[PDB]
Design a protein around this ligand. Structure first.
Ligand SMILES: [Cl-]
Length: 169
């Protein structure tokens, strides 16, 4: 029947925490084999907003819309890594593909949450062009660090933001 938004956010946060843990584990596996010297970034990745000062009902549609968009970008990047990241990263399977499938599940859950709560849906956006292949094997490894680290941060701020917002529902 009418969903309880608090319970729905609780459920969504639990699944986000699961994906956060998977992402953290894969990032540490990657650093064990290919250590990183510096925080790595990629221009094609979303800029994370890190909103959590004061969040309430008015902000919920926007937070969820932005999360959906960000997670879809991370999915594109994860798929790109698996296909074109270079042989150096074949060792990250099958875990990277499992992460991809779980990200898909969370994306489905977010669209359903928005539908059941009758929240305004984003306009069908123009899909981003293909990602260029890495310019080198080490460039591909740095991109993997950037992708897993950025996904981790996105999921951490989603957990934080959604739980804070829930306190005002
Ligand atoms: Cl399920």
């Amino acid at each position: 029947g009418s969903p309880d938004p608090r319970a729905e956010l609780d459920s969504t946060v639990l699944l986000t925490r699961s994906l956060l843990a998977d992402t953290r584990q894969l990032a540490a596996q990657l650093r064990d084999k290919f250590p990183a010297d510096g925080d790595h970034n990629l221009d094609s990745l979303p800029t994370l907003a890190m909103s959590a000062g004061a969040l309430g009902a008015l902000q919920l549609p926007g937070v969820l819309t932005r999360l959906r968009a960000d997670l879809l970008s991370y999915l594109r990047h994860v798929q790109w890594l698996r296909r074109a990241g270079g042989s150096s990263l074949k060792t990250l399977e099958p875990e990277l593909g499992t992460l991809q499938a779980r990200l898909d599940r969370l994306l489905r859950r977010l669209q359903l949450l928005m539908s059941r709560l009758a929240l305004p849906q984003p306009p069908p956006d123009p899909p981003a062009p293909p990602l260029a292949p890495p310019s080198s094997a080490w460039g591909g490894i740095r991109a993997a660090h950037a992708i897993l680290g950025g996904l981790h941060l996105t999921l951490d701020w989603a957990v934080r933001g959604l739980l804070l917002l829930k306190t005002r529902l």
